[PDB]
Write a protein that binds this ligand. Structure first.
Ligand code: NAG
Ligand code: NAG
Ligand code: NAG
Lengths: 178, 199, 188, 264
């Protein structure tokens, strides 16, 4: 519908109309209602899991091998995964980076050596409202990612396109229209 | 390093032959270079010992096949002819992964003599060459023999010419030197002895 | 590859200089090997100027472009052998050279010639062999010719006490044809 | 009104950057597989490098070397490799040869500094040093900042060949022959490329933070921002710009209150 509009820059604005050119999810596009297959990671992935079952994600190429486990544990070691990883039956050489810190939307990107994760969750198919997503974390690893796969403890997936929007702030500095 | 050879061996025209080269020294190739008698050196091929990837010469495409295990490396040659009598050497070559290696073949094995003849195993025939006096070892197979004088009690003037090949497939050499003198001839691949008295 | 000269003659104390002649490009490393008769070869120089481990300071090669030399400063009595040049490239991956033989020079001598009639033991057999012998001469070359009213020859190497040669020709004839040796030499 | 004094507000960091671990490394890499190290969250002293007389080349492209201790940087890198002495002129925006075509390529709109000195004392053995390599054959050029490690036989226009050198089946790499009796220009130089993006900032040099002065026409420097305005107190909330594409608010980097900027 009108989901997946985030804050592109780190600039406060107020009572204006601004026009950017970044990766977005197109309005009135087709998403894929899943019910855990490996999926492509083309240019960025909108994610939206309405529901404590959806735990984390694995990001990689051969399945180097980014890992998010939910205390968000993030490890960019070189891993050996099983056929169907789930929750701890998930899985080491040259560990390089480590980090620890209803409707729940997420937007993932991978550009320029950064790894950008955006977040928002509201209480409640996908609803018809309009949401903004404040950025959650910014990970400097710079790796090669082509496929990904969610995890579970035994949702929806879009894809980001290059477009050109025209956003709308207000008196408080919050996107309410596009 | 230290590299070991199999040993000398004699075959028949049309048969096969297999030569080994042990390496008791733990990223290097193995080359095989052959030397016909009275000739220059000549390259046969190389084999990578780990991945078993081989390259052969242009002249030896179809006749040579080099194998390995895990070190010990084997070279096998089939369809023998009269032009495959030589000595076979294995040579180590230090390598750089990606570019041409600038080091040469620094460690060589000692050599494997391969004789390809048609005739049968035979004993010599000593003939006393009295006049400067020489026992004429004649019509034997295979090379070598050993000739001494006075059962090894004479070293000055003792000549022993190299064995030449005749047209009957047998070798023959002479042994001259300048009191009773006796030559003593042995031939290890059949052990005959002919302690001829020369006058 | 092409070495020159074919044979080279010196005296102990001289200065040896011999040349190879390589091919196409600059990715064409070259080395030098030494072989004594009855041994295995031995690395001396790699990449045309760098000595291998254990080689003394008198072996030193140079040269660049399409011309390579090996140069020995003071010649020892243990440095007489055969020398090879060996390229390393892509299309022919080795291509050894042809060989250059090194030897000792002394005063021109003359051989003492002998001859041997065939013994009756051999005369019973059916084939007779008549040996004609030379001893202790230093040119390298001689010509032994048979005159009656074929043969093969064999030549020993350098001696380690006086550096001379020997030779023996053998006229081989049948019994019935036997029933029916000029030495050409420049020091005589 | 003329500006009265100067205001400098940098964050309260005290660690220093690992330039020792880049310049004073024991062994560098070869140019076909060149090293990389991303530098962030430190204080960078570019006064201990341009004052050293050891560096026989100190180019800078988007910035002058004197004015390095005043800017705040984003995305600093460092790229270490060993080349031959007559190929340092190729490490530049838009050159040709065999290093700037198959080995290491810099973009056209480049902002950074190239440092290169002599290391014949450390990179020259007696028999020779044959394990500093460079790529000699490749099918096509490189994109800027593209790495390529591969040991595969470069098949030219002929019958293919499989891990075997042959007729038009060259080796891809080539080793420099560093022996110490070379002339200069055949000796091993040793190169570091510092690249950074200008204008979230982390890395900048040792300037001391002053205090805060309000309701006076002063000159300010808030972690990179130069200008001339009057600082007041804000209402609701970095870089705070408005419809005029100009900054008129700024978060104070040492105490998280929001300030305004009114022009004098
Ligand atoms: C990422 O991986 C794919 C295949 O694994 C490869 O084709 C691509 O070149 C890689 N990306 C980079 C920047 O090398
Ligand atoms: C920064 O460090 C100074 C000195 O230690 C301290 O007084 C100040 O409160 C610190 N500010 C923050 C935001 O940590
Ligand atoms: C590297 O070491 C030298 C002394 O060995 C020193 O003078 C120089 O400042 C060092 N460079 C750094 C730490 O960047």
């Amino acid at each position: 519908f009108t989901r997946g509009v985030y804050y592109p820059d780190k600039v406060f604005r107020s009572s204006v109309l601004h026009s950017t050119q970044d990766l977005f999810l197109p309005f009135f596009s087709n998403v894929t209602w899943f019910h855990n297959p490996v999926l492509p990671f083309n240019d960025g992935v909108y994610f939206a899991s309405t529901e404590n079952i959806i735990r984390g994600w694995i990001f990689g190429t051969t399945l180097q091998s980014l890992l998010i486990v939910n205390n968000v544990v993030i490890k960019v070691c070189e891993f050996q995964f099983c056929n169907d990883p789930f929750l701890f039956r998930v899985y080491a050489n040259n560990c390089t980076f480590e980090y620890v810190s209803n409707l729940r939307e997420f937007v993932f990107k991978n550009i320029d050596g950064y790894f950008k994760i955006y977040s928002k969750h509201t209480p409640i198919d996908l609803p018809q409202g309009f949401s903004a997503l404040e950025p959650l974390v910014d990970l400097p690893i710079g790796i090669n990612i082509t496929r990904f796969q969610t995890l579970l403890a035994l949702y929806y997936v879009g894809y980001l396109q290059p477009r050109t929007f025209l956003l709308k702030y207000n008196e408080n500095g919050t996107i309410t229209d596009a | 390093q230290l590299l070991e050879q199999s040993g000398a061996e004699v075959k028949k025209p049309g048969a096969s032959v297999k030569v080994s080269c042990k390496a008791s020294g733990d990223g290097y190739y193995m080359h095989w270079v052959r030397q016909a008698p009275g000739q220059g050196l000549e390259w046969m091929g190389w084999i990578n010992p780990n991945s078993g990837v081989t390259n052969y010469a242009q002249k030896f495409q179809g006749w040579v096949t080099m194998t390995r295990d895990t070190s010990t490396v084997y070279m096998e040659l089939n369809r023998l002819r009269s032009d495959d009598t030589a000595v076979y050497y294995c040579a180590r070559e230090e390598t750089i992964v990606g570019a041409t290696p600038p080091y040469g073949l620094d460690v060589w094995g000692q050599g494997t003599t391969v004789t390809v003849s048609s005739a049968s195993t035979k004993g010599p025939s000593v003939f006393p060459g009295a006049p400067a006096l020489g026992c004429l070892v004649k019509d034997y197979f295979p090379e070598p023999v050993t000739v001494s004088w006075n059962s090894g009690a004479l070293t000055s003037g003792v000549h022993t010419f190299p064995a030449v090949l005749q047209s009957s497939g047998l070798y023959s050499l002479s042994s001259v030197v300048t009191q009773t003198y006796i030559c003593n001839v042995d031939h290890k691949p059949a052990t005959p002895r002919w302690t001829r008295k020369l006058s | 590859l092409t070495q020159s000269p074919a044979t080279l003659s010196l005296s102990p104390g001289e200065r040896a200089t011999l040349s190879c002649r390589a091919s196409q490009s600059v990715s064409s490393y070259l080395a030098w090997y030494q072989q004594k008769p009855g041994q295995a070869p031995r690395l001396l120089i790699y990449d045309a100027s760098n000595r291998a481990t254990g080689i003394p300071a008198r072996f030193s090669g140079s040269g660049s472009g399409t011309d390579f030399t090996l140069t020995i400063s003071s010649l020892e009595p243990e440095d007489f052998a055969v020398y090879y040049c060996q390229q390393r490239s892509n299309w022919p991956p080795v291509t050894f050279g042809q060989g250059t033989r090194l030897e000792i020079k002394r005063t021109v001598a003359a051989p003492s010639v002998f001859i041997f009639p065939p013994s009756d033991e051999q005369l019973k057999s059916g084939t007779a062999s008549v040996v004609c012998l030379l001893n202790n001469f230093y040119p390298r070359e001689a010509k032994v010719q048979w005159k009656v009213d074929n043969s093969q020859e064999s030549v020993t190497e350098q001696d380690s006490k006086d550096s001379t040669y020997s030779l023996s020709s053998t006229l081989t004839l049948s019994k019935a044809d036997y029933e029916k040796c000029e030495v050409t030499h420049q020091g005589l």
